[PDB]
């Protein structure tokens, strides 16, 4: 479905921070909380792909884009961060902050 890919693409392109998530997903919640802790709400969109008729197609496309079909799937300015574990690694190592500084999102 070109439609599914167009829709996922629009989410990633229109929002600097894009998080694909699902219902009652602890690592989704943890990742979103970390990101909101950088006061990124204004530039973030969270998409619940479980409440969607095309969940399997969305997951398959996220795997084509990132190598994994699991949520959360995290993009920052169209770059693949990955899952919550990847976010925690980048955060602890300083990379996340560096990303956000280069985007003008944190001073
Ligand atoms: Zn579920
Ligand atoms: Zn429940
Ligand atoms: Zn949405």
Task: Sum up the structure in keywords.
binds zinc ion; alpha+beta; 4 strands; GLRX1; monomer; antioxidant activity; globular; zinc; 107 residues; protein-disulfide reductase (glutathione) activity; Glutaredoxin
Q: Beta fraction of the residues?
A: 15-25%
Radius of gyration: 13 Å
Count every helix, treating DSSP H or I runs of 4 or more residues as helices: 5
Reading off the top of the CATH hierarchy, the class is best stated as Alpha Beta
Helix content, binned percent:
40-55%
Task: Identify the strand order in the major beta sheet.
Answer: 2-1-3-4
Distance between the termini: 40 Å
Count the strands?
Answer: 4
Pfam families: Glutaredoxin
Disulfide bonds: 25-28
Domain Glutaredoxin: 17-81
Binding site for Zn(2+) 2: 45, 47
Describe the structure.
The chain is an alpha+beta fold and 107 residues long. The chain has a single domain (2-103), classed as Glutaredoxin, CATH 3.40.30. Helix content is 51%, strand content 17%. The chain has helices spanning 2-14, 26-37, 55-66, 84-93, 95-102; strands spanning 17-21, 44-48, 73-76, 79-82. A 4-stranded mixed sheet has the order 2-1-3-4, sandwiched between helices. A hairpin with a 2-residue loop joins strand 3 and strand 4 (79-82). Helix 2 (26-37) runs parallel beside helix 4. The structure holds zinc ion (3 copies). It comes from Plasmodium falciparum (isolate 3D7). Mn(2+) 1 binds at residue 24. Zn(2+) 1 binds at residue 24. Mn(2+) 2 binds at residue 39. Zn(2+) 3 binds at residue 50. It is classed as oxidoreductase.
């Amino acid at each position: 479905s070109e439609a599914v890919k167009k829709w996922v693409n629009k989410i990633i392109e229109e929002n600097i921070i894009a998080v694909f998530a699902k219902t009652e997903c602890p690592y989704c919640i943890k990742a979103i909380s970390i990101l909101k802790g950088y006061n990124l709400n204004s530039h973030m969109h969270v998409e619940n792909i479980e409440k969607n008729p095309d969940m399997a197609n969305i997951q398959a496309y996220l795997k084509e884009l990132t190598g994994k079909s699991s949520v959360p799937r995290i993009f920052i300015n169209k770059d693949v961060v990955g899952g919550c574990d990847d976010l925690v690694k980048e955060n602890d190592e300083g990379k996340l902050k560096e990303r956000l500084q280069k985007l003008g999102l944190v001073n």
